[PDB]
């Protein structure tokens, strides 16, 4: 029995968030929650929310019990990137990709 | 084809390739090379042969 949650099109860069997601893959819900709170990175705020929405799902919809929850798998895939123009010197214009993440947390129960 | 005659960008010193107008068949949406034209497919098969 697993229970998952996904934030889609979260407008932070995949490379950047994966770092935070990485820090809590395979941890007790409890530890993950601790880790994110004291992780110094904008992505900590988002992973947080997925993790939490996920656990909500686990208890509430799937008959899993909060004290048994752990981060089974979690990952960030990249979504549709937002292209914006950056003006450079000498008349030239580059193109910035304000990138975008689809964060997934999947919680399982740790038997015992 | 619908386009202008202008040379989209100069011959030399762009870093890009050379092009003339954008009608050139080398471009997407440029004209076709040797594609079909209206055309009469008929000929006069010898009367004796038909008979």
């Amino acid at each position: 029995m697993e229970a998952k949650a996904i934030a889609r099109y979260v407008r932070i860069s995949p490379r950047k968030v994966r770092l935070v997601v990485d820090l809590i893959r395979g941890k007790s819900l409890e530890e993950a929650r601790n880790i994110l709170r004291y992780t110094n990175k904008r992505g900590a705020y988002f992973v947080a929310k997925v993790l939490e929405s996920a656990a909500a799902n686990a208890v509430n919809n799937h008959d899993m019990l909060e004290d048994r929850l752990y981060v089974k798998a979690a990952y960030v895939d990249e979504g549709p990137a937002l292209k914006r123009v950056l003006p450079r010197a000498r008349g030239r214009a580059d193109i910035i990709k304000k990138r975008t993440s689809h964060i997934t947390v999947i919680l399982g129960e740790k038997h015992g | 084809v619908a386009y202008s005659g202008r040379k989209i960008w100069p011959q030399k010193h762009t870093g890009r390739a050379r092009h003339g107008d954008i009608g050139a068949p080398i471009f997407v949406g440029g004209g076709v090379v040797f594609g079909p034209k209206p055309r009469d497919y008929s000929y006069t098969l010898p009367k004796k042969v038909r008979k």
Binding site: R90, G91, R92 | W9, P10, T14
Partner: peptide, 22 residues
């Protein structure tokens, strides 16, 4: 140490930039 004065083969750079293309 060469005497026969060695002319440059190349012009000292440089003039102008092909800015822009768009």
């Amino acid at each position: 140490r060469r005497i026969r004065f060695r002319p440059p083969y190349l012009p000292r750079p440089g003039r102008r930039p092909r800015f822009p293309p768009p």
